[PDB]
Amino acid sequence: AVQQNKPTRSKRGMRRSHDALTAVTSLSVDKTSGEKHLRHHITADGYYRGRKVIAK
Amino acid sequence: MIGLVGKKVGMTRIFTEDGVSIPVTVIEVEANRVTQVKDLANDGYRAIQVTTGAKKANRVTKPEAGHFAKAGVEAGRGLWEFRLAEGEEFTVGQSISVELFADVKKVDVTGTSKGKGFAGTVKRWNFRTQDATHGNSLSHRVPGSIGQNQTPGKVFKGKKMAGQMGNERVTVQSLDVVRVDAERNLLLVKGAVPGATGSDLIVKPAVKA
Amino acid sequence: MIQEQTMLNVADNSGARRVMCIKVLGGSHRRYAGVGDIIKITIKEAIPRGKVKKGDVLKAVVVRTKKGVRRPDGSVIRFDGNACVLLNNNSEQPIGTRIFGPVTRELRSEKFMKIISLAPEV
Amino acid sequence: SNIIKQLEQEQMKQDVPSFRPGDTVEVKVWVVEGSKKRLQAFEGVVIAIRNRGLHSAFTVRKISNGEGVERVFQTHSPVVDSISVKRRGAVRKAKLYYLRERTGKAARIKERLN
Amino acid sequence: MRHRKSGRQLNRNSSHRQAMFRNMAGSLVRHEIIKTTLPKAKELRRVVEPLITLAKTDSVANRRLAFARTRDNEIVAKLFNELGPRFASRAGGYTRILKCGFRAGDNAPMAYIELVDRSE
RNA sequence: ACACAGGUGGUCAGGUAGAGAAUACCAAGGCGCUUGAGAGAACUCGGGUGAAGGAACUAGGCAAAAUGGUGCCGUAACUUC
RNA sequence: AAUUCCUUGUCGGGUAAGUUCCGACCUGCACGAAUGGCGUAAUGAUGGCCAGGCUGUCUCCACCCGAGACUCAGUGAAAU
RNA sequence: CGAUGUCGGCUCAUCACAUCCUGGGGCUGAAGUAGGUCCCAAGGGUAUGGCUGUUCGCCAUUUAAAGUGGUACGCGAGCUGGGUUUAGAACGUCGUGAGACAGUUCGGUCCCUAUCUGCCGUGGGCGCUGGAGAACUGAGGGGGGCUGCUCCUAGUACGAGAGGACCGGAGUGGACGCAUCACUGGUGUUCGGGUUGUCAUGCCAAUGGCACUGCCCGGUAGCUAAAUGCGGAAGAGAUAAGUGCUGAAAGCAUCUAAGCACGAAACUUGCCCCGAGAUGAGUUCUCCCUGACCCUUUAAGGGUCCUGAAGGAACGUUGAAGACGACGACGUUGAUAGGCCGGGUGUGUAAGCGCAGCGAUGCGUUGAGCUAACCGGUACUAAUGAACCGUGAGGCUUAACCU
């Protein structure tokens, strides 16, 4: 085992300056039902891309 | 003295009355469109923007669109600015055909190598592996001894180790001309050329000759 | 390929069937030997009508190979067995009176006035 | 672009035989040797696929020993002076690689008798 | 590394890379809608549309399509009767995948595949 | 010390083959594994397939690889027979 | 020589070339009689040597499959 | 001694020359071909087998060469562990015996979750003075070269003979390192043929599993080098060692002082890849923004209300691009991917039906049926509509033109 005390909090506090995040980036609102959704993803209302896909 | 761009259509063997089959590569060289002629010597140098092909208009931004607009309605990608020294070319925008090589014997071709990714020392530098017969364990695809024992304290820069291979510029320094026919956009050369769709295949006359 | 420790047969007339390559000769850091090339050889077999003892070390010229030839005219020609002609250690040139097989067409123009005069077909 | 297909079509000959695996052939070549332009003739057997277009190999064996004495004749080559078809064997397979580990008296290109 | 190879590897046993979908195609011809992960719905759509293009044509001394495996006896009343004749005048594409994102919080993207001639 | 790729005396025993209680598919019966969703890269390790050369490897044919089964013909020196 | 350094022993065969092998030499620094002397057939999950066999051991490894190394989710150590 | 792994070889070479070869310059007590020798250039390069664990040694064979000298008598968080070195004892020696002998021998210990200093790749970022993109340049860095062989000088010269060359010329293998898939071979667990054993589908027929892809024979694309293919040049410049012209210091003399011509593989120029963190931030082109008020010990910062270009990212069908990032092609303004229609190529003539034969088996229907990675067409499944980030012509000063 080999370590000089601890890795400094100065370097650990610099570790977030480069991307490591996994989460959906933005949500949008449907023009046929007013419902909130992801881009290229169907609504909870059964509407997508200006058409009704299924009845809910 | 300058060069041209044209697209590869295939490779074959021509057959010759010396018995040897002579492997040949076929390139179709549509006249290079000429977007600007700079004979006016601005900042002390002369140039020509030879241009070939165009990019889809949904992926051409205005900073690039206005850079082809003064010689046609089509725009984008390969503009190809070459400099002019010790040679006069016609002062006005006029396209250049492959007949530029109809009095040339030898050429060279430059383009972009195939993607070979990650590589490692062995596949980048074509390096001798360690033998796995009579022992040796846990490493065989390593160069061995990256510095001269204890007194270096350090490794030297740019040595034959690590790195990634391909997806970069590459030259083939000597090819023979076999046939040129500008009415058919034809260039026929003795040899083979590097890379596929990433390769631009910039063809030049021999400057040694 | 014909490399160091490769076994061949003798094409010098009424010779043995096992003789082994030990040096490719001629320099320029070249490896292997082709048909019509000269090598250093050791005698792995002796026979009652043979001219040489087992374990002797000589020069030989390659005249036949299973791998064959493909570069002088751009097309492939392959043969039966791997064969060579033995040369005298004092005076050089072939040691019998004849050589076996038709040989390569490039061998008919080679650096050897006593090999290009014999009765091979090609 | 089509110019490569017209280039292979002007280098191909105006008529050549359509032989296949299980055929026997007689071929004459001028060997590209020197000032006499002298002819060489040979008769042998085909077990290799032709196959098609300009780049046919035309690989021929003698089929008379446990080593085949193989030669690549190239149908469209300008060193060739005649190509003649002789007979065809009773084989149906086109791979035929088992004949490479037999001598000529066990490689008579089949007779079958159905 | 990959330079022509692209086919989804997914499962440890070689045959299980097809059996998982051969077995589930029996559930799809039964229920006409299936819930499963997006790569499993993509590999379920694989080769089964060409199997409906095979149910299009007149067969002889062969009923083996979907019957050689999974031991269902309702398929032999659907096939050549309505499965085939409902899909032969469309020109390809017999399934719609209804591609969705993660089901609730784990890294599993969801698909809601349907056999395309369904009514509501 | 563990809801552990480990260990634990005796009892039973069906089909096809196969010398068989081996092995490989199946029965009676049991189980899909107290992590899921993927993606298919250096590199190490366990495997699949191979051209021409060939013990030259290495201190060392070590390891690997052929040879191998069931019948028939045939079979040296020597021997405590 | 399971004994010998002297030696690269010497001479013969083997090998391209034999400090290793076997057969011999006597000039044995330091063989010899139940702390056994000298021989020996059959035999070896053997120390050394020869020929024959085949081989990824090698010339020189190349392609190809399988897991880990990975991107996420749920959980989640120790010496230092 | 509160820690310093040993011998050779492999593996990696490195750095030099009191130079091994190659380049160049002089001699020989050098006729030529040979043998022997002095020394400038460190620019290009500098062996394998046998016996042995071997440095050493002898011994077989090359190369233009296998030489001298250093590096823990050079490499163990390198490999080998054969030799040297313990833990049973076999043979020899000294001793009565423990114990002793620069004695021989069988067998005998080489294991690691990358913290910092170094280096490489790939993203990200700040710097650059309004914001953005595309191409260019070169302060800086690396590559490369030498040898053979055929032809010419020339069977000249020298040499009774035997033999047998210079210096300037032309061509071209191969080494070395990389690039192609035309082919030529290997492979090819998304294909196919033959087949041993077995299982189910009631049975049989016929299919679909499992046994290493069951095996055996094969194989497309792709991968791959054996396949085929290529270059570090010339010319000029300068010039060490060296050869000399004219000639002074110096009535005479001198290769030097002034005035000059020659003098090498290399060097400098030259070929090619990379390069503005060159904060020294370069050269050139292309796109775009025309709102209004207010505060400060106010030439620089900070607010309110309006307004949001050029450009970027996100979303997405695919990849001769890829660990992951990142990136080419491509998005309904459509043939990018799958499906379809037709064909191609591969596989090789199935099943069912009719027949030949005692039967195994064979024939016709049948160039059958089937079909990995292709290719002429085609919107059936998928390849948004908005929102986000980025603003509002941009500081201080002088010089130049016109109001």
Q: What are the CA-CA distances from residue D10 to residues B15, B75, B176, D53, D71 (Å)?
A: 11, 38, 21, 12, 25
DSSP chain E: --SS------SSSTTHHHHHHHHHHHHHHHHSB--EEHHHHHHHHTTHHHHHTTTTS--SS---TTTSSTT-SSHHHHBTTTBTTTTTTS-S--EE--EEEESSSSS-EEE--EETT---
Please indicate whether, in this complex, the C-beta atoms of B21 and C73 are within 8 angstroms of each other: no
- As a whole number of angstroms, the longest Cα–Cα distance in chain B is 73
- Classify residue A51 as exposed, middle or buried by CB count within 10 Å of its CB (0-12, 13-18, 19+): exposed
Q: Is D79 on the interface with C (CB under 8 A)?
A: yes
Q: Which residue has the tokens 């490569």?
A: D4
Among B127, B155, B150, B149, residue whose Cα is nearest residue B140 = B127
Strand G and B134 CB separated by under 7 Å: yes
Q: Who among residues 114-153 of B has its Cβ near strand F, under 7 Å?
A: 117-123, 131-134, 137-142
Contact B98, B76 (CB under 8 A): no
The string of DSSP letters for C55-79 reads T-EEEEEEEE-SS-B-SSSSS-B--
The answer to whether the Cβ–Cβ distance between B9 and D3 falls below 8 Å is yes
B124, containing H or E segment: helix B121-125
C121 touches chain D (CB under 8 A): no
Q: What is the largest CA-CA distance in chain C?
A: 42
- Contact status of B183 with chain D (Cβ, < 8 Å): no
Contact yes or no for B8/B189 (Cβ under 8 A): no
In the 8-state DSSP scheme, what is residue B136? -
How many independent structural domains does chain B possess?
Answer: 1
Which chain B residues in 73-102 lie under 8 Å from chain D, judged by CB atoms?
A: none
CA of C104 to C1' of H151 (A): 24
Tell me the residue range of the domain where B44 lies.
Answer: 1-209
Strand G proximal residues, E:56-115, Cβ < 7 Å:
105-107
What are the strands, taking DSSP E only, across chain B?
A: 4-5, 7-13, 23-28, 36-38, 46-49, 81-84, 106-112, 169-181, 186-190, 202-205
Q: Which of A24, A42, A55 sits opposite E98 (nearest CB)?
A: A42
How many residue pairs from chains B and C have C-beta atoms closer than 8 A?
Answer: 8
Chain A closest-CA separation from residue E120 CA (Å) = 8
CA distance B123 to B162: 9
Structural domain for D85, as ranges: 1-113
Q: Provide, as residue numbers in chain D, all residues whose Cβ is less than 8 Å from the Cβ of B19.
A: 32, 77, 79
Torsion of Cα atoms, D17 then D22 then D26 then D30, to 10°:
70
DSSP B32: B
Bases of chain G with protein Cβ within 7 A: 14-17, 57-61, 65-67, 71-74, 79-80
The SS3 call for residue D24 is: strand
> What whole-number distance in Å separates Cα of residue D66 and Cα of residue A14?
75
Contact A38 E99 (CB under 8 A): no
For chain D, the domain total comes to 1
- Cα-Cα-Cα-Cα dihedral of A41, A47, A48, A49, to 10°? -160
Helix and strand tally (H, E) in chain C?
0, 5
**C-alpha–C-alpha distance, residues D41 and D84, integer Å:** 11
| Residue D74 at interface with chain C, using a CB cutoff of 8 Å | yes
Resolution for the entry shown, Å: 15.0
Distance C35 CA to H328 C1' (A): 49
Residues in A closer than 8 angstroms to E100, CB to CB, are 41-42
Tally Cβ neighbours within 10 Å of residue E24: 18
Q: Quick check: B138 CB within 7 A of strand G?
A: no
Residue closest to D16 by CA, chosen among D84, D71, D73: D84
Residue of C nearest to D39 (CA): C122
Q: Specify the 3-state DSSP secondary structure of C104.
A: coil
